[model samples]
Each structure stands twice: as C-alpha cells, then as structure tokens.
Target: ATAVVRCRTRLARRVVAAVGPDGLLPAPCESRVLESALALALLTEERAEADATARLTAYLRTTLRTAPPDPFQCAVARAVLGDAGTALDAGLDGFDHFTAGRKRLMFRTVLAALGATGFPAVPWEAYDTRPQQSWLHMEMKALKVLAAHGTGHPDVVRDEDWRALLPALEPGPAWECNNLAQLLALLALRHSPRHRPALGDVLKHVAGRLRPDGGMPFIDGMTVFTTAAAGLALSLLPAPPACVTPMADALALRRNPDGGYGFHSGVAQSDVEDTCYVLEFLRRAAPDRHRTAVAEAEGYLLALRNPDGGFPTFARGTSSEIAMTAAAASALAHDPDRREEVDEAVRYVVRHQRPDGTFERSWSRNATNAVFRAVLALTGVAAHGEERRSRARAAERALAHLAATQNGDGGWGHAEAEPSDPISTAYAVIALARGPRARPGGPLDRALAYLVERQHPDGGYRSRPDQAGPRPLLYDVPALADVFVLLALAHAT
Candidate 1:
C-alpha cells in the first residue's frame, strides 16, 4: 500500500495547492502554459535553453516546475532563449513567434494522436469529451495480454475470485463484451481442466456475436482498435471459426503503407496505439506467417523511442504519455529480440514517478493515466528484482493516495481532489491487483468495494460521477465491463 499512500500524499498536496477558499479548484494557468511549452518543444525539435528563446522559456519554467532539462522541455526552452536574436519571435500572438511551419506540424501531430484526419470543425472542448469507442480497443489489447501470458498463468482466468465475471460476459454487436467473454472462456477452457465445460458454454455464446463475414464489425464506426481486437479474439479460438477469416482479411486491408495499422483506413491516421494492436493480432494469428509485417510494426515502434527510453504515441520526438509508453513497452516485450528495451522502458516509467509515488498521466494531469500506465509498466517490470521493488513501492504509495482521497461514495477521483468515475476506479483497482501492493487488507480492498457498489443493476459500470463529459459508447460493451469486473473480483478476494 506504500504506492497508494504516496499517491495520496501527493494528491492531498496538489488539491490543497489548486483549491481556493471558495471550495472550488481552478486550473493552474502557469501549469497549462508550461505543458503547452513542452508540447511545442517536442514538435519543434529544439532545446528550450537556446539563446534565441531564453527569456520566455525561463519565465515559463520559473512559473511552472519542469525540471531535469530533458528533450521534453528543451526545444521550447531553446525557442524562448533564442527570441532576442529573432525579433519576429518576440511576440506571443503570431505565427512568427511560434513558427507557422512548426506550429502546423505540431497541430497535425495532435490531430493524428486523437485519431483525426485534418482538424475537425468541432470545438476542442467538445472533441475532448466525445465518446470515442476505445473500450473495444482496450479489451482486445487485454486479450493479447492473455494470449501471451494468460495461458501460461491460468490463474488470470481460472481463479475462484473471478467466478463472478460470468454474468457480465454476454457478447453483442460491434465491440461488445461478447468477444471478450468468448476469449476469456477459451483461455479458461484451454488452461483449466475444472472450467472446461463451463467455458465451452461461454464460448458458444461468444460465437453468437460474430458477424456472418467472420469479422467483428465496427461498434459505432470504423476504428483500428475494434478491428484488431476482433482479429485477436478470432485468433484465440481452438479453430478459426466461420467468422475468423473475414476478420483477418478485414484487418489486413487496413494496414498502412508504413506497415502499421491505422484506426480507419485513409480516414483516421495511424499511431502507436492502433499499430500495436494490429501487430499483436498478427503476432498471435501467425507468428511465422506475418513475420515481415510484425517486424515492420516493431521497427516503427522502436523508431518512436525517445532518448529518455520512453516512447511517444506518434512521431519520434513527441512527448511521452504513460499510455503510449506502456503500449510501446508491451509491444517490445512480445519481440524475442527486444528484451533489452524492457529494462530501459521500465526505468523510464519509474523515474517519472512523483515523490508521493504515483506518476502523472502525462507530464500534464495526475489523472487515470497515472494509474493505467503505472499498472502496465509495473506489471511488465514485475519479473525483475530492482524494477519489481521500485514498482511495488510506487504501487503502495498510489494505493494509499486512493484510500485517503476516497469520496463519501467510496470511489476515488481522476485526480487528487477531483470527483470519482467508474472508469478511473476500475483502472485503479486493476493497477493495484497487478502490482506488489495487492494484499489481503489494504487500500486495494476499499477501492474494490467502491467499484462493486457502483456496478449498475444491468451489470455494467458507468463512467465516474465527476466524469466531465459524455461516456464513449464502447464503454457500454460487456467485453470491457467484464475485464474490469473480473480484475476487481480478482483483486478484492
């Protein structure tokens, strides 16, 4: 629970610092500016301390504490330090200061990261909260986790604690829980003699959710996540069912010229997350058949790694987010030749851990990103001694942070003082379960209870109460619900 405790301490301090006497917390403008500066730095490929752009960079850094002088902040600092020599850069409002070409590239990268083509007409605030169907994508990624390690370690699916997961396993059209249920059942049947009969029944039902063409159709629209997820699910069955071939074909058609997979062919641009999913499917379906594709995907991911050992979701020099970094690490872990990269990635994640032990989601907010990223990163490192200890301590601190920050309803918020959401709660529980902080009596238990209480009568979990906007339709699928529910059950017991 040390991880939880440490996270809690930091959350408490952040909350105190961000809150006004009026009882409402306000966004820190200085922090926002610093974050923007960092983002700009990454896109421009310049150091923040360069002579032409020093003053502005120094002012922003002094106002907001981005330290250690890494590439993440260096470019912006360089621009600020270089301003004096460049009279056009002195102004803050024009393209002259930011550099039109660089700004365009940076904005393009942002759009790509969000899975958009050209910038949409929608307001930034609206788009940020839109219900993206990421649940199916996340679920499929989970399947890859199982396929790689779940069979070897049957406890992930066969343990008694996970028994409660059965009721929520129903499959449905689109990226619903049905595929996940079938995948889990297959895993259990393949690994646990005790669950074979029951798992067969579950698989039968899961089979019902497949499309006539043997593919999983887009939930609401086209997304590489769902396509790749469906591919992963089909690859897991004892035999490629009637629906398997089409799904595989559909996925293959979506491959980008760059040898990666995009969210939607020609529409949504490709990035690390979707590319990782597709590669995972290829790796699973035919370790030997798609050898070239897999290798290309792996190379693309490796190319994105920063000097600090972390990876950005898009281009080589972009800032790292825990989510993308974890995906990068997971992808590398699957490669037999890339074992060396794992330790470096683990160290990068650990170094980003806050003093209180929890990590910030990005260099931006201390939200669910921290919990989700920490879980994946720590889980990856659990096999090593030093990495394991560091992750364990961090996990404990995060748990304590959750315990202290629990709201009256028993749930923890997205950030230290923010309101709670089922999405974040689920993430926190799953993260704790996978880390060394998992124990019989600890903050993990309380967090699990909170999740259990929030489960809807219909058997799905809702986005958190403090969730700022519309919940993504994908979150409604049983596939995602079942994973989190199963994770909660596994940890709670």
Candidate 2:
C-alpha cells in the first residue's frame, strides 16, 4: 500500500510550472497570460526565487494596469497583489458583492488572499455534482477558489464511478492543465480539514498525458465522439447492420465507468452531448444487447439537470446552455413522464433567443447550428391546457425564427451575416425540414443545393474549406461534415 501510494505522489508533481525562468508558462492567453504568470509567482511563495517572483509580479503588473472583467483573472490579480504588496488592485473594491457562482467565487478568493474579512461562501447547489461538471476534474481554477477560501462544501465531492470511467492510465492530458487543474483542486481540498487522503489518489491516476514540452490539451485521446456521428450518418443508408456492427460494438465497449460517453476513448468523462450523439446512432446500428447501455445513458441525461430545468454541457456547470439543453431534451424526450422537463427546456431555449431570432453558443461558431438543435428538441414538444397553448405559440415562434434566419444561398454561417459552411448548412437542413417551411423554392432546397455545391467530387463535405478555427476533431470527434451532409441528403427525398 505504501509503495503504491508513493508512486502516485511522485507522478502528480510532474506539472508544467506556471512561473518560468523567463516571462510566461508553457502556454499563452489573450489577456489572462500575464495574470496567470503572477498567480504562478505568488502561488509558489517564491521563498527561494524571490527575484524570479518579483520579475513575474512586474510582468503581471505591466500587463494589466488594473483588473479585467473576468472573475478568474480578477481573483488571481487580487491574490498576487495582496500577497506580494504589488497593489494595482484596480477593481478589488467592487468585484465581490455580485452573487453569481463564478463572479462571487472569484471575489471571495481574492478577499481571502488579503486575509480580509471573509471566505467565499460556496453554493454547492449551483454545480452538477454527479457525472460532475465538464473539466471538473480537469481544470484548476475551481480548486484555487476552494483552496483560497479554505472551505470544502459537501457538494464539491467527486462521483464514485468517476475514476473508473476516466482511469487516465494511458495516453491523455494526465499531466496537462485540464487534468492538472483537477489534481491541483484535489490537493487544494487537502487544506480543508475535511478533505481525505483518498481524494489524493484521484490525483495519481492522470499519470499518462504528461509532456516534456509543458502544458496539456483540453483532452488526451479520440474515438467515440467522431465514431458516433459517423454511426448516425451510417444509419441514413440501408448498408446492412454488418457495416455498422463493428462501430456499434466499438461504441458499446467504450461505456464510460459513469455509463455515458465522452469524445475520447481513454478519457471517460461522460459528456451528455457525446451520449446523445451516441444514442442517436446506437439505437439504429445495434438495437440488441446495447439496450442496457442506452437506458443508462438516458438516466445520465435526466440526472444532468440544473435548477432552471435545463441541461448543462458538462456536469456541475453553474447554468445550462442552449444547444446542450436542447440536444439532451431531444435525446431523452418522452410523451408523458418527461413532458414537464421537455416543456421547461423548450421555454428556456425560447427565452434565450436573440433579437434577430437566433441563438449562439461560444463552442459553436454559428446560430443556425444552435437554432436547428433547438428545433430538434423543441419540434414535437408536448404540454397541456394553457401550458400547451403557450408551448404551441413558442413552437411556432421557434420555427419562424429559424425560417427567418436561413441564408439566401440555402445555407447559414455562424448566424445570419456569416458565409455558408457545410456543417452549419447540414444542421440547417435538419432544422428547416421541420420548421415553418420557407415559401416557393424555400430555404430547405436552397440549403440542400448549397450543400451539394460544397460537396467534393469524392462525395465528402468539408465544414470550413478555408480552415477557419480548424478544429479537425471537436470532442475528439472528427469534423464529420461529410457524414452530416450525407445524412441530410439521404433524408431530403
């Protein structure tokens, strides 16, 4: 037991140090890089490297003459200033009082650093505790807040099945910032008398993704997310179960310890979006024995609920998102038992629509993708009495909203103004097919035409031919522009 325990300790220490011999750590940030460098400097306590710490403080001070809008950066700035007496505590006076989880949490930690009045009072209820929040175990900022405030809420605990899903034993971000944040958070929890040593073992498991160069990518591997999308596209064809069986079996074998699926094969963080994509395909490819897996994934969707009755992208996020909420609702949607949940989700999506009648998530570049997804989940919404009438009005508005935003080229950009792309256009086809139906030649046919125009001679589609943002595989899912377009085209008849 002792040898096994010590083994993990040595490994978890292998992190990319924030404070470097030069100016920054191994990474860059749009504006937060300098603040992170100072946090690194102040965090190290730099007893031996006083000069280095001073230099880092100078760097941070020069970067931002005052605090910025971000709570995470503001807190880091406040801490560095208080401990090192480097003032320039620009917005420290007004940063705290706001009550939202992130903003308030940042305010409290910064105050705690100054040894000022009080600690950040955590709202355990705000976060999704089970299947926990995405990057919950991967990022470090949340842990710093807990550590600085010197308190651990019962809700901040990890899920029991969490590690089994993502053993992090093989190649992954076990050493990078996403996973590093998790370990550091666990370590920070130790400062609270309530934290247990068992929590630390969670730290050692992420021993694989370390890099000699420093830093970590968002995730460590690839498999399920891309495969699921492909499988869904495959379902559009009559290609025998044999063609999909291998992938279906592969997806089945990839069950995360948490009973859901994430993008990567090795990391079993169990994202609900990945689960929905997998369910969309699995129900068609391998309808047999995988029933048990499907049921569990459905359960995961139900459990990933927020106070507002919508769903979050990752577990434990403070609020639900537009696309994820709709996707989950569409996947787990039922006629009676879940009607209230589904209706609540529809209302939430409708409530958040933009002035011009579109919605956008930062993760996605355009609103059509988001709008279509909302349409998918909200299309067949079920309700009763005044509720039913309100929902019907909501549904019509949603359909009209999407119809209004259709690009004249029969495609959509990130929203109305952007140029058309295959992925956005493909999603648009799926949404528009069920919407208010554009008049005359209509948006659907044009969008389909736009898609056909974009298709390569080889019969595959490229989302961004220009390679904008260039995410070859989001969630470790390959850019499935081809599969999505094919699926849309297959249904166009």
Candidate 3:
C-alpha cells in the first residue's frame, strides 16, 4: 500500500492552497473561452464604458489561434473578431442536439446573433411562451432581446422586454451566477445612456471576477461545495487534517437560514447535491461541534423530498432526479431514525435505473459517476425479503457494468471505449469497493496501482474534468480530482 500519511499531508496542502481567512477554500477553476467570448462581445459595443474588453478580446484571439474550433465558442469568436478560415469540424457541429429545450433556444439565439447561416431568425416565439424563472431562462430571454438589437431586426425591444429582464439584474446577493452578471453588463452596455447610474453596483461585481488574462468562468466560486468535498476526502485519512476545524468554521457561516448550503457564500439558492456533500462532511469531520447545523441540514433535505419519494435538486414540487435522489439516500442512510425515508429514496433510485444497468447522467459527464452514487445509496437501504434481493441484483448489474467498462490499463474513463483518467477511475474503484461480492484480485489491484502511480509528487493528480454544465459541456474542478482519488486510495487501504 502507498504511504497514506505523506499523501494526506501534501494533498491537504493543495486543498488549502488558496484558503481565505474565513477558512473557506477559494480556488479558480479552468477558464472558459466561450464565457470569455460572450463577455468580450458585450464589451466591444461602442456604448460599453469599460476598456477591459480590449484585453478580453485580445486573449480570445491569442488562445483560439491554437485551440480547436469548438463550434459554439469559435462561432462567437468569428462574430466578435471577423472569421478566420477555421472550418467547423463536422463532428462538433451539433451543440443544439445535445442540450435540452430552453438551452437549445438560447443556443439558437446566440447563433442567430452571430449571423451564422441556417439560424436566420431568433426563436422569439419559444422564449415568449415559457414560464421558467431560473437564471438560465432569464439569460435566454435576455439573449433574445440583445440578439434582436444586434441584428437590427424589425421587432423593437419594447419597454416591456426591458421590464421583464430587469428583475434578474438585481446586484449583490441577488445576482449570483456569471451568466446573470454578463447579461446585466450586456444590458448596461446597450442601455447605459439611460440605465448607467442604476447598474453601477452590478458592473462592479462583474468587474471583480474578470481575469487579468480576459477569461471568465460559468460561476464565480464554489467555496462551500469544494471545501466540504475536501473535508470529506481528508476524513478518509486515519486522522483529521489540520484544516478540518477551519473548514468547518467557514462552512458553518455559509449555512443558510433554511439550513441548506449553496455553492458559495452570499448565494441564497441552495440545492440537494451541495447540501448532501456538506452534511456528509459535517457528520464525519466535526459532528459534535456542528450538531445543530447537521440537524437543520437534515430537515432541509427532508423538506425537499417530492411525492415520488425521491428528491429534487432545487426545491419541493419540482420533478425528482435520480442523481439527487441517490445522494439523499446515501446522506440520510446513517440515521436509524430516518430508516423509512432512506428506504423510500432507494426505491425511487431503483425505479429510475436504466435497463442497461446504469443511470442517466447528472451534473457530471461520466455515467459511472451516477452508477457509483446509485449503487452506493442502494446498498445502504435496509431492505428485507424480495426488496433486499432486488437491491442486491441492481447493485450487481451496476458493478458488472463498471467491470465491463475498465480499460486495459486497469482504469475507467468517462465511458466505455474512452481513454482512462484518474478521476473516473477513482469513481469506479470506489463503486467497486462497495460491492464485496464482485471483488476480483487483479482488477482491484491494477485499478489501485493505476491511481497510486498517477499521483504527482506534490500529491495532485491531473485528469480530464468530468463535471458537465448547461448540459453536455465539460468544465474543470481541479480540487475534485484530488477529492475522489483520496477517497479511492483510502478505500483501497
């Protein structure tokens, strides 16, 4: 076995590499060229008062010169700076096919603004009909409004259009996502002559997140989620890492009045996934000190359960999702008092599993990530008679799927036939660890060796990011790799 102590110390150093005084981990993920392009396009307008767009524009031009023509980002670049002959790869041509209804409408609006052929008109009718109030929906609506102005279409952006989009522009805690910030800035650039005085605070918030290299990300920070993940990973060690208490301190302050945690501080919206991670971490790392927070969080999770006996990612009354349901089942499984609730959650998860023995994708790109979560939660359900037998059968099929997907190098990737990576491999290893019946000597050994060999001397491991956003688009979460690998290695020992 590898030296767990050295591994823990060095990895803990990396985990707290950017800890703020509040003890929350504040780290920047890989930058997004597509997001940078959107911000740059808004700044290029003559009405934009900010001069930093010049830097953002320059950054994109330099970066994309060598990068592949990622159809969506490249098309936006082609509009901002005149087209370079980078032919859109035929295989990468279909962003709309991968994304869902509202997002697809937004994609169409963006391409229509870029004057790309085939999308000659905006999908205004589709946006006009919807009632979604999420930041994404409002962003889609805002995009249509801006696209109409950009293309000089006959349809005027009426006062009511501005009125409809105005509510999403609330600054400070209200405007938490990067998409909303960029939309606000775009509106300010277009209507600045009239709305300049009012949008000052909004612009200031957006300005602080801009990278010196002119890059931006999908979100500003995920301090709460990342910190709790780090704490959970560190707890897998024989002793607690030095930063555990501080991490707990920062996380405690972030707990909302409703007892759920958001991705970061100052954001009022919270989801089941983030709350599950935080609750799992608190229960393990600092249970007594944060007992009240744990009880409140448990209440928050229970409150979000739907009539289907599963949990929704955001709030009550929304459709239940398998991934969120799996997480809740695992998180609440520890309490003997919540036995019935956990059993029902497992039932919801089992009901949704695909016949192919895997669950559909969630916020992550890897299907195995969902499988790992599903099987892990299912195994925790205290079932009896046929119910217990059914759970075992489901877990076996999922474990078999994991076995079938392992690459020759004894690691797993995002999916079958894909090249293996550390993060995905770690997920597979952890999932296999849950199935005692399926343990084979060579597979487990090779997978463990695969992970151990990949760890850098500094205790970090590099792997393709598995987190998906806006649907199928992948984004990096550097610390997440360390978190999963640490758990895998801990399980191995």
Cα lDDT, model 2, residue 387: 64
The lDDT ranking, best first, is: 3, 2, 1
Per-residue accuracy of model 2 over 1-493 as CA lDDT, tens digit each: 3321222122112211211232111221122322233234333532323443454455456545643333334445445555321222333323221123343444345445444435645444332233344454332244343443455344444443234223222333343224434433443443444444343344333323222322122343334665676566556554422446666767777778767886655554677778888887777766665888877777778888787877876674546878887887777664266776777787887787766556654345555667667777666565568866765555566556656776777777755677777777777777776755445577776776676567554444556521111111122122445555655654443
Candidate 3 structure quality by residue, lDDT tens digits, 30-73: 66666766666555543353656776677788878865435666
In candidate 1 the C-alpha lDDT for residue 63 amounts to 36
Q: Count clashing residue pairs in model 2.
A: 13
lDDT measured at residue 72 in model 1 versus the true structure, 0 to 100: 21
Give the CA lDDT, 0 to 100, for residue 433 in model 2.
67
Question: Which parts of model 2 have CA positions greater than 4 angstroms off?
Answer: 1-138, 141-218, 238-241, 334-337, 381-392, 436-440, 465-478
Q: Write down the TM-score of every candidate.
A: 0.47, 0.58, 0.87
Error (Å) of candidate 2 at residue 383 is 5.9
State how far residue 200 of model 3 sits from its true place (Å): 6.4
Candidate 1 residues lying further than 4 Å off, grouped into runs, are: 1-222, 226-252, 280-292, 362-366, 382-388, 436-441, 464-493
Alpha carbon lDDT of each predicted model: 0.46, 0.52, 0.70
Given candidate 3, what's the lDDT at residue 133? 21
